[PDB]
Amino acid sequence: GKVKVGVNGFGRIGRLVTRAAFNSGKVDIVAINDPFIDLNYMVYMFQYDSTHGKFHGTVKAENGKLVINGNPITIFQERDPSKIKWGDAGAEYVVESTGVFTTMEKAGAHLQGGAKRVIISAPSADAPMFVMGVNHEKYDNSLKIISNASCTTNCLAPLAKVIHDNFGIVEGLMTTVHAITATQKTVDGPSGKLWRDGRGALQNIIPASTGAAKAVGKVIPELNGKLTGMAFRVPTANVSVVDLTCRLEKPAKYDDIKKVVKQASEGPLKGILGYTEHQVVSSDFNSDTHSSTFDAGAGIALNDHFVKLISWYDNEFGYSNRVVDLMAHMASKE
Amino acid sequence: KVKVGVNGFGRIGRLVTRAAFNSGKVDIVAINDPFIDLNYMVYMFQYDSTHGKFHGTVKAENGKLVINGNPITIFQERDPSKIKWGDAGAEYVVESTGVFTTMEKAGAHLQGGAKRVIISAPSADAPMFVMGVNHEKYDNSLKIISNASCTTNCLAPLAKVIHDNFGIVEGLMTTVHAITATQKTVDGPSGKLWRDGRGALQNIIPASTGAAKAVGKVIPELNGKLTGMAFRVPTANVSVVDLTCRLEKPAKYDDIKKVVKQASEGPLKGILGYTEHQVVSSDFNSDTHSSTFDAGAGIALNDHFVKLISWYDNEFGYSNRVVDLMAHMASKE
Amino acid sequence: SMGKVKVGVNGFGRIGRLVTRAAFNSGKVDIVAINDPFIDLNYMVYMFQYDSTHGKFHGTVKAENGKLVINGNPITIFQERDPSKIKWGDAGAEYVVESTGVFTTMEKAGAHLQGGAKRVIISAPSADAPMFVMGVNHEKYDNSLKIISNASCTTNCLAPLAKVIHDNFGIVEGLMTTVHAITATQKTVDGPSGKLWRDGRGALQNIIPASTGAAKAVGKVIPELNGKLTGMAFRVPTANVSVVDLTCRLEKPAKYDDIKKVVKQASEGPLKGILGYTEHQVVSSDFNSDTHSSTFDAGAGIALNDHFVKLISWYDNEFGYSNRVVDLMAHMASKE
Amino acid sequence: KVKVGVNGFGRIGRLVTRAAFNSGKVDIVAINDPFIDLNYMVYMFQYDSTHGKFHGTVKAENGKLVINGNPITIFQERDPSKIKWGDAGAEYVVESTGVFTTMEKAGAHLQGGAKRVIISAPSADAPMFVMGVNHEKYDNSLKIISNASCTTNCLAPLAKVIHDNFGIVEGLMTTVHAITATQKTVDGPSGKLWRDGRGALQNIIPASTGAAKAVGKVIPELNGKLTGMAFRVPTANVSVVDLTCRLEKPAKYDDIKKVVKQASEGPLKGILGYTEHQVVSSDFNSDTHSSTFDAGAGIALNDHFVKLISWYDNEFGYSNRVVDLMAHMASKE
Ligand SMILES: NC(=O)c1ccc[n+]([C@@H]2O[C@H](COP(=O)([O-])OP(=O)(O)OC[C@H]3O[C@@H](n4cnc5c(N)ncnc54)[C@H](O)[C@@H]3O)[C@@H](O)[C@H]2O)c1
Ligand SMILES: NC(=O)c1ccc[n+]([C@@H]2O[C@H](COP(=O)([O-])OP(=O)(O)OC[C@H]3O[C@@H](n4cnc5c(N)ncnc54)[C@H](O)[C@@H]3O)[C@@H](O)[C@H]2O)c1
Ligand SMILES: NC(=O)c1ccc[n+]([C@H]2O[C@@H](COP(=O)([O-])OP(=O)(O)OC[C@H]3O[C@@H](n4cnc5c(N)ncnc54)[C@H](O)[C@@H]3O)[C@@H](O)[C@@H]2O)c1
Ligand SMILES: NC(=O)c1ccc[n+]([C@H]2O[C@@H](COP(=O)([O-])OP(=O)(O)OC[C@H]3O[C@@H](n4cnc5c(N)ncnc54)[C@H](O)[C@@H]3O)[C@@H](O)[C@H]2O)c1
Ligand SMILES: *[C@](O)([C@H](C)CCc1occc1C)[C@@]1(O)[C@H]2[C@@H](CC[C@@H]2C)[C@H](C)[C@]2(O)OC[C@H](C)C[C@]12O
Ligand SMILES: [Cl-]
Ligand SMILES: [Cl-]
Ligand SMILES: [Cl-]
Ligand SMILES: [Cl-]
Ligand SMILES: [Cl-]
Ligand SMILES: [Zn+2]
Ligand SMILES: [Zn+2]
Ligand SMILES: [Zn+2]
Ligand SMILES: [Zn+2]
Ligand SMILES: [Zn+2]
Ligand SMILES: [Zn+2]
Ligand SMILES: [Zn+2]
């Protein structure tokens, strides 16, 4: 009954999707491809995690396979995704978590080796994009190549849904203060396409472009063209925050806003959108599996139509859990 | 050159003194700090993790601190009232401690025979200035005055240009702020401000700030039209303001760029910077601007609703302003 | 006569909170009272519940009827600056953990006896109290000793390793560096530290050399090494976990594989839980929340020759030490 | 002044260039990087998170990089053997890419008409030099050489003074070293060196290093008598050496201080520094010494067994030594 899954790119997201799948039992990981991490290295990289701690389970190399909690995983080492024998390994869905194959054309290479469906762990220029709790019911069986959007979109869209559903968003500008990621550099280094992203990640606050707010208008079509934003990368290793400045169509007191977010967090968006009035800081959300946790005490309203709302997200662990949730929902529809 | 005294030799005290000797706009003659003896003052002024070693000379001679060959008198006097300023020849005096922010508690410097007191911080009830915005509203009647905060000094110059040209209907500000001395290394006690106790290396920390409201006190027309909040992040210096605002008259982003650029080259030269370069925070380390507009970092949704980004070295910009203020108060004497 | 000793904690800080956490996790002692004039009851709930380094408390914690209630156990809360005025006896606290950092002499720590505590355990080195390292000299504790010290995090890392090396090969002389995480004594940005100037400098920006008596202290808990060790520290910008680097000359020849064998044997037997052993390609975060006093890193050390070696051992300076405070108190209880 | 080509405009190539223009000791006339276009070189050279904005001018002009008014020929060759150094007039080439560290690979620059190559890293086969210690062993027969590492350049000058005066029987070195470009921001792949893949911001990371053993090549009397290891820690620049050594002759700590201080003022001036100040790592940012002995930080167990501490700006000290080595080579012809 559980869908069998293959992971392309055993990185932060590849490893934590694997970790999430084994922790939740919602899907079964049967194959991993990563040309830059051999089998014995995968054991080490999966077992020890600077951010989320040692894996709670067993991992070893046995008979040329990676065995997680007694479950053997076929390991591939292919640079070219069209050459990965997913079908032979029994992988039905492929998580595409390399960062380099994000178009439907590129991600579609996995169909050549026998995958049935591909879930891109990032925004896509052209794939249908999903955020669990917001538009995952728009998924249908005709969609072989889909995107789970970004961490930032998965934080903003559940909050935006609640605000838009209750009061309407006329227009919104978003900032995300975002943890450093593997794309950044330790010291000033080369990033020919994006100069600021080459600058030393430990030393700097680094402004960066993001399509994450615009993307919310693709997962919530009524908000198409009504949102945009940007990011600052800062020197923390995990956990990020969204700051949405928006104008509301209908007036809302800040306590009205709190009430509808809290109600959504306790009912239909349970496990997706969280709600806190605690005096939280970023490390309080390390390994928190929500997509989005609204911080009641941190936001501020100028008036009943113009507000700044704050939501936290563990950019690694919330998203990884969402990738697994999406695949479980896809499988239920087969 | 007016002759100046400093109460506290903390980051602002030291950096005002540094700015005073580097600019040569004013001239320091006295300092007071109980948690800090003369020999220790030499070391704290000479070496600085953030801004580097002082360019010049500093020594203890005859019980005075001597900077670039200039003797300075050193009080230890635990109570501001008890501060023999006039003795030392301190015309104006900078209140850098920030537990004497009110006008009464900081009136105390008048008791010691000091003429006029520039406070290095927001005040509940004193007249706040920001150079380039409302300093031309200083006349001689004024004693205890405020130079506002670092963040207000970043936000107000940009707000002035944007309001002057397009009108700000309303705005909400975020500052992403480097760590400060009020934060803790590891989770520790901050009983009035619990989030501020949490370890500063490990955390993004949301914080209240009155800086955006305060803009409405130096720019009366923006009173009640701005508020905001902050995030403390684990960098050692240089902060950024993110102002999201709704404009009355429509403005293409290229028009916003044009007016900010004009202002930076003209009347706000030295105060409001303008760049289109692909900058990051450390590029503004020891930059003496109040506010530098980052053209490439900002983003418009439409002609009425825009997000504008401005950098400030929270330590250094402000310190230079406190000196600039005194040079300008000296020309009004 | 004495069963599970009841404990009071003076100073609810990193160590006071994590000793509390260790006591509830291990069950070895019962925390019945806490004193901190800088953290009121509602604030204690928050500071205990959420921890940047070690994560949310796995249990329940709340305030009710003026008590702190942890895992349903009510704890009496005091707010006294002067330790002679804390009513430990009325609250049922028998041993007191003196974890403020400002009462480390037998005379200052002994203030707790005035309010009815029976014994005091100073969570730091002491100029005059008997000092103990679990696994090394705790069996030298006797019930005549009412005020004692559990030494420092660093001494608890070095001593168990120094014991094994000395016992097997003989240490002629040794010099130790500890590369140590930042602590609450340091500053976020350059600020005043009148007696220790370097310690005022910004903790996030700098490597900061600091004196430490931790190596010299090993010669007090292992008398045969008296005057044979000393060392120093560098503070670096990590929030927790530290490492000891011991360079020593050995009396008998020791191949590195022999050193590894005897450490592994000690870690598996008499020093189990105290001294660990690994050959894994570890880094500091791998020991976050690790309860060992000392984990020998086989791959990180290096021998110049059979008599001159550099040995590396990791320690969670918060969590290893806090567990050791609990362990020592339960040992003390067993000897009443 | 000898004319110099720089292969690779990473951190070393950039700071060698900066050292060259700052000191004036050599004339940079060409730079090769296949990966980094001219406009991007301007940006990478002008702005530096660690050392600040370049003190001077830099611009693109007529297809050349122009620094302080000096045009520099820019190449974009993947294959070192194809770089036309001769046509650009580059006599010596600094091989700073990190991937051409053997004599076979480094020697490709000679095919394009370079006369000598200086590898800005340890080499498995090129002779290694440390200025102040064995640079007088350089001779005109040596067409391809190495300037060793930043750590060897720190340890060797201190080891030389101690050995010369007291004799080193045996020594073990630890270096607590700032992060570098080879590390990762979060846990990532490093297949030959698993610990070095782990997040550099989060971790103390132990690493093997031949830097201490290498001292036995530049000081042959110490062959087999020194080794050590490194800890990478989350600071962005400046490192420190901790040398634990047994001495043949007795030495009071105060005798150690005297001989290091004399060395710092005489033959090793500018190379080996000496301080009794209460320094921390940031006090050495942009310091051009190879090695600064920290008198206050070290400790003696006895007259024969000591721990000595010496700071080094791994970037700036080393880059200045590459320039100084080239000036010394130029002095021989
Ligand atoms: N905070 C986050 O990291 C985050 C959150 C949500 C989504 N994502 C997205 O998920 C993707 C991966 O994110 P990440 O942080 O884990 O980066 P990452 O660098 O850790 O992932 C790359 C991994 O895939 C492997 N890989 C690289 N090229 C490959 C190839 N050609 N074939 C197979 N494997 C290859 C890498 O060696 C590495 O193990 C990115 O698109 C990223 O933006 C990231
Ligand atoms: N890595 C470590 O933190 C570590 C490891 C081993 C031992 N120790 C030792 O344990 C002691 C505490 O270490 P720490 O890191 O937790 O420091 P800390 O600052 O976190 O502990 C101080 C706590 O006690 C409270 N306190 C202060 N003065 C008090 C008083 N007069 N009465 C009652 N309570 C008071 C503080 O408000 C604070 O809550 C120190 O001596 C320290 O060196 C610390
Ligand atoms: N001893 C060795 O065997 C060895 C091995 C690897 C690296 N290294 C050396 O690297 C040194 C300096 O490092 P850094 O901190 O400046 O690193 P860096 O990454 O900042 O500089 C490397 C630069 O070389 C450039 N580069 C890469 N390939 C190139 C090519 N084919 N042609 C021209 N340029 C190219 C890159 O653009 C990059 O900017 C030392 O760490 C170390 O000595 C040495
Ligand atoms: N409105 C506000 O936001 C607010 C609130 C409180 C304080 N403050 C002030 O506090 C300062 C913080 O800036 P900082 O970086 O200089 O902090 P800081 O900690 O470095 O400044 C304190 C310095 O003054 C010295 N000092 C302390 N008490 C003193 C006294 N009674 N008399 C004389 N000197 C004393 C300190 O020992 C220290 O050297 C102001 O810049 C300002 O922020 C402002
Ligand atoms: C220094 O820093 C060392 C050698 C890095 C690693 C190391 O430290 C001690 C022992 C080892 C093996 C450098 O690599 C510098 C590099 C950039 C930063 C980095 C820390 C400088 C500028 C360097 O010159 O590159 C050449 C080299 C091998 C050494 C180097 O100094
Ligand atoms: Cl865990
Ligand atoms: Cl309009
Ligand atoms: Cl936990
Ligand atoms: Cl400079
Ligand atoms: Cl002797
Ligand atoms: Zn309305
Ligand atoms: Zn300077
Ligand atoms: Zn004027
Ligand atoms: Zn022997
Ligand atoms: Zn026992
Ligand atoms: Zn001196
Ligand atoms: Zn010479």
CSV table of N, CA and C and ligand atoms in Angstrom, one decimal, chain D residues 131 135-136 324-325 327-329 331-332, ligand 17:
chain,number,residue,atom,x,y,z
D,131,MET,N,60.0,32.5,4.5
D,131,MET,CA,60.8,33.7,4.6
D,131,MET,C,61.2,33.8,6.0
D,135,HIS,N,64.8,31.0,3.3
D,135,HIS,CA,64.7,31.6,2.0
D,135,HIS,C,66.1,31.9,1.4
D,136,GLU,N,67.2,31.8,2.3
D,136,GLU,CA,68.5,32.0,1.7
D,136,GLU,C,69.0,30.7,1.0
D,324,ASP,N,57.0,38.9,-0.7
D,324,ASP,CA,58.4,39.0,-0.2
D,324,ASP,C,59.3,37.9,-0.8
D,325,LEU,N,58.8,36.7,-1.0
D,325,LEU,CA,59.6,35.6,-1.6
D,325,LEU,C,60.0,36.0,-3.0
D,327,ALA,N,60.2,39.0,-4.3
D,327,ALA,CA,61.2,40.1,-4.2
D,327,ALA,C,62.6,39.5,-3.9
D,328,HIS,N,62.6,38.5,-3.0
D,328,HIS,CA,63.9,37.9,-2.7
D,328,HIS,C,64.5,37.1,-3.9
D,329,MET,N,63.6,36.4,-4.6
D,329,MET,CA,64.0,35.7,-5.9
D,329,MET,C,64.6,36.7,-6.9
D,331,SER,N,65.9,39.6,-6.3
D,331,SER,CA,67.2,40.1,-5.8
D,331,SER,C,68.4,39.2,-6.3
D,332,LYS,N,68.2,37.9,-6.7
D,332,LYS,CA,69.2,37.0,-7.1
D,332,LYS,C,69.5,37.1,-8.6
E,17,ZN,ZN,66.3,38.6,0.3
